């Protein structure tokens, strides 16, 4: 909707696992915009088509570009869901670059944060698989 999504994304960094702090800004996503997220385990965090394409069908390349660690139980997610923005909405965005590259990956992907993901994003099409 109209909350400070940049500040929400920033708040999840600087302690615990993700101790590095990225640069976060607010952008208005447009109705009909498409973003992507891992599945299962939908969260407030998404990425753009450019980031997905740069991974070349490799989950390790994708999650390293977003500096996301493998899930403690399930490991890296192997399925990607596309979502469609239902209405103009604020997202927090920037580059995932500030974590330790040895542990997290070199980063460089474009991230989005939307706390209102459950109500503002509609899944579109089937999930699709990505390789190792």
Partner 1 sequence: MMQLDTYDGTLELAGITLGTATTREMLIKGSRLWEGWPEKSDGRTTSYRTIISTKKEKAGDIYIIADFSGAFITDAVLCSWRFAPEKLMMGIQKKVEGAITKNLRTWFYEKTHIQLPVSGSWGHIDAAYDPHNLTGTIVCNYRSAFHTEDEWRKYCKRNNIIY
Site for partner 1 (CB under 8 A): which residue of 2, 31, 100, 122?
Answer: 100
Q: Which is nearer to partner 1, 49 or 71 (CB)?
A: 71
Buried b (16+ CB within 10 A) or exposed e, 83-105: bebeeebbbbbbbbbbbeeeebb
Q: Which does 30 bind (CB under 5 to 8 A by kind): Br ion, partner 1, none?
A: none
- Give yes or no for residue 102 binding partner 1 (CB under 8 A): yes
Q: Which is nearer to Br ion, 84 or 95 (CB)?
A: 95
6-45 binders of Br ion (CB under 5 A) = none
Does 119 contact partner 1 by CB under 8 A?
A: no
Sort 60 into a burial class: Cβ within 10 Å, 0-12 / 13-18 / 19+. middle
**Based on CB atoms, which residue is closest to partner 1, 103 or 126?**
103
In this structure, the strands spanning 45-47 and 121-129 are unpaired
Residue 19 as a binder of partner 1 (CB under 8 A): the answer is yes
Q: Does 100 bind Br ion (CB under 5 A)?
A: yes
User: What is the total count of residues that contact partner 1 (CB under 8 A)?
Assistant: 25
Q: Segment near partner 1 (CB under 8 A), from 6-14, 25-33, 85-93, 119-127? A: 6-14
Residues 95, 106 contacting (CB under 8 angstroms): no
**Residue ranges in contact with Br ion by CB under 5 A:** 100
């Amino acid at each position: 909707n109209d909350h400070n999504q940049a500040a929400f994304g920033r708040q999840w960094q600087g302690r615990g696992i993700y101790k590095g702090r990225d640069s976060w800004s607010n952008i208005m996503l447009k109705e009909g915009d498409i973003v992507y997220g891992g599945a299962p385990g939908q969260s407030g965090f998404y990425f753009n088509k450019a980031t997905l394409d740069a991974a070349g069908g490799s989950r390790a390349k994708l999650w390293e570009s977003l500096q996301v660690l493998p899930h403690e139980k399930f490991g890296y997610r192997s399925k990607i869901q596309a979502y469609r923005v239902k209405r103009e909405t604020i997202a927090g965005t920037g580059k995932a670059i500030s974590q330790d590259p040895t542990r997290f990956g070199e980063g460089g992907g474009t991230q989005f944060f939307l706390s209102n993901y459950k109500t503002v994003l509609e899944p579109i099409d089937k999930p699709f698989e990505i390789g190792l």
